[PDB]
Amino acid sequence: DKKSARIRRATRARRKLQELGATRLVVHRTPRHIYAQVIAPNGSEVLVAASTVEKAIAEQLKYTGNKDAAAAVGKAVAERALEKGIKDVSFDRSGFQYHGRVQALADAAREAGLQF
């Protein structure tokens, strides 16, 4: 398939981020939206969420789903978390290739003080 194929591509980088017990930032990307959340080391409960589905992030956007949309939500995730005290996370590709808007999403959060 297509989703079960990608969801298998992420199980190694994910199952090492669980052995290390490190808070991870996981991204889900869609041809219309891009999501990102900061998940506790338990993997069950999430501290910070920010995505283009939100009105406060999307109403400032020409079209959610391009590279500059990912930057606009990458900025949002960091600024939302830096007040919470979460600074040191580890990036989670979640199966996607680190090349496109996922790359642009990561750098925008990296440039806003987030360490990873």
Strand 34-39's sheet: what is its strand order? 46-51, 34-39, 24-29, 90-92
Number of residues near RNA (by CB under 7 A): 59
Extract the tokens encoding 85.
């005290």
What does the per-residue mask of binding to RNA show for 14-53, with x meaning CB under 7 A? xxxxx-x-x---x-xxxxxx-x-x-x--xxxxx--x-x-x
Q: Is 87 in the site for RNA (CB under 7 A)?
A: no
Burial profile 21-31: b = 16 or more Cβ within 10 angstroms, e = fewer: eebbbbbebee
Which positions touch RNA (CB under 7 A)? 1-3, 5-18, 20, 22, 26, 28-33, 35, 37, 39, 42-46, 49, 51, 53-55, 62-63, 65-68, 90-91, 93-102, 106, 116
